[PDB]
Design a binder for this molecule. Structure first.
Ligand SMILES: *[C@@H]1O[C@H](CO)[C@@H](O)[C@H](O)[C@H]1NC(C)=O
Length: 456
């Protein structure tokens, strides 16, 4: 009946298989370039060409990340009022490539003198490149997601749900490619070759759109004022999610990591790969085991209950992380070993890294539910005219959540609490931090359930 009809719609893509693969490939390349920049920015800035202090490099990276969130609402407005989505994304990609071209030249010893030969050694060029890259990333992110779903929007609301699955899958594949290959070359072979590859990725991503150009009011005021509270209630979700991104890697550094060979010192960025490594293996499987199974039974059809399920699994992951951290802190009092990651030696307990697998499943399932469904809700529950501007607010509130999470981490590090009073974390109670994150996620779950019920 109706179910049969919806399953038939799931039979999507169909005619438009080109128009989509082009968007998927473009997003893959863009994410590869972004993760190539973000993974080893601090090591580049604190090295031989640049004598920046660690605090200066951290502030520079923080400003670069903050720009990519602040520019999203303005990038979306530019793509709706003055230009089209295609032209806006093309201009953003051109600016992104222009900012891209700066880093290889600085890395190259011959061309460094031309740019900044004669505190911060080369602040103007680096800041201009980072500003251009941030604006390009912010404009691409706020516009690629609604542009991609535009092709599959005719076949009902079931095709835009399947597209947002292979979009996230392509994002994570690009993350794996960038953090595995490019991040390896940037630290082992050379920075020139490690930064030339993402520039080539940006160049290829620009060609794909040029090749694929041939195949691509009170009510809305009410919609705006009705969807603003839902976005506001999602700030604690991002607050917890980014803190889990950071502290999970912090814990992984202090856990027994096996060696691969007999180029040395595997990059620390590889650890982040773990999370995305799950996501790939989940997204096809899930799709199948969710597209029939959860559709013919009429289970969990809305995009907000899926966010609630994602929050539940986030809380479960926080609790598992707290348990593992308590075990690690109990074990570390007996003996400790030293292992080198990059150019720094961490003191780690003799507890295997793979014991961290149960954590990354629970958040991974969360990113199966909360991450995709958030984009689906942002796309569907938005006025037709202001599409790609509501996504701007979505990605801006994500940045607000990230910054308030950084502030929360700074809060528990004061002398009064002392949870994070000190690269060694053997003297820091990360388990209490994980339990606090779990409590925050539970309160967010309850508040979001109330908000979702009121919204519907
Ligand atoms: C760990 O590092 C400390 C400081 O260098 C050193 O004294 C200790 O012997 C190291 N332990 C091992 C097993 O290398």
């Amino acid at each position: 009946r109706r179910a049969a009809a919806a399953a038939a719609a799931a039979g999507a893509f169909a005619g438009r298989r080109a128009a989509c693969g082009a968007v998927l490939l473009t997003e893959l390349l863009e994410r590869a370039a972004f993760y190539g920049i973000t993974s080893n920015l601090v090591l580049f800035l604190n090295g031989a060409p640049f004598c920046w202090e660690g605090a200066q490099a951290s502030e520079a990276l923080l400003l670069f990340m903050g720009l990519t969130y602040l520019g999203s609402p303005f990038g979306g407005w530019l793509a709706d009022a003055r230009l089209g989505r295609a032209r806006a994304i093309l201009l953003s990609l051109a600016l992104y490539l222009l900012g891209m071209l700066a880093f290889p030249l600085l890395a190259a010893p011959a061309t460094r003198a031309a740019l900044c030969g004669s505190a911060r050694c080369c602040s103007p060029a680096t800041f201009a490149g980072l500003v251009l890259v941030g604006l390009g990333v912010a404009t691409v992110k706020a516009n690629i997601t609604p542009f991609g779903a535009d092709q599959v929007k005719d076949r009902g609301p079931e095709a835009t749900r399947r597209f947002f699955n292979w979009f996230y899958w392509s994002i994570n594949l690009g993350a794996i490619l960038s953090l595995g290959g490019i991040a390896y070359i940037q630290q082992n072979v050379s920075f020139v070759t490690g930064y030339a590859i993402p520039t080539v990725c940006v160049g290829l991503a620009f060609v794909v759109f040029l090749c694929g150009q041939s195949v691509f009011k009170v009510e809305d005021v009410k919609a705006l004022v009705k969807i603003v509270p839902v976005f506001l209630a999602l700030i604690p979700y991002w607050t917890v999610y980014f803190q889990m991104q950071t502290t999970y890697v912090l814990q992984s550094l202090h856990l027994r990591i096996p060696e691969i060979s007999n180029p040395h010192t595997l990059p620390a960025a590889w650890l982040t790969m773990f999370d995305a490594v799950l996501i790939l293996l989940l997204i096809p499987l899930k799709d199948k085991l969710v597209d029939p199974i959860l559709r013919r039974h009429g289970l969990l059809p809305s995009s907000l209950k899926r966010i609630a399920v994602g929050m539940f699994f986030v809380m479960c992951s926080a609790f598992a992380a707290g348990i593992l951290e308590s075990k690690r802190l109990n074990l570390v009092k007996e003996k400790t070993i030293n292992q080198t990651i990059g150019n720094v030696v961490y003191h780690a307990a003799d507890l295997s890294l793979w014991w961290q697998v149960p954590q990354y499943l629970l958040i991974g399932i969360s990113e199966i539910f909360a991450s995709i469904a958030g984009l689906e809700f942002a796309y569907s529950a938005a006025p037709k005219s202001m599409q790609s501007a509501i996504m701007g607010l979505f990605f801006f509130f994500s940045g607000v959540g990230s910054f308030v999470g950084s502030g929360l981490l700074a809060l528990v590090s004061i002398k009064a609490i002392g949870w994070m009073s000190s690269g060694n974390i053997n003297g820091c109670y990360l388990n209490y931090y994980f339990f606090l994150l779990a409590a925050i996620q539970g309160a967010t779950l309850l508040l979001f359930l109330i908000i979702s019920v009121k919204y519907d």
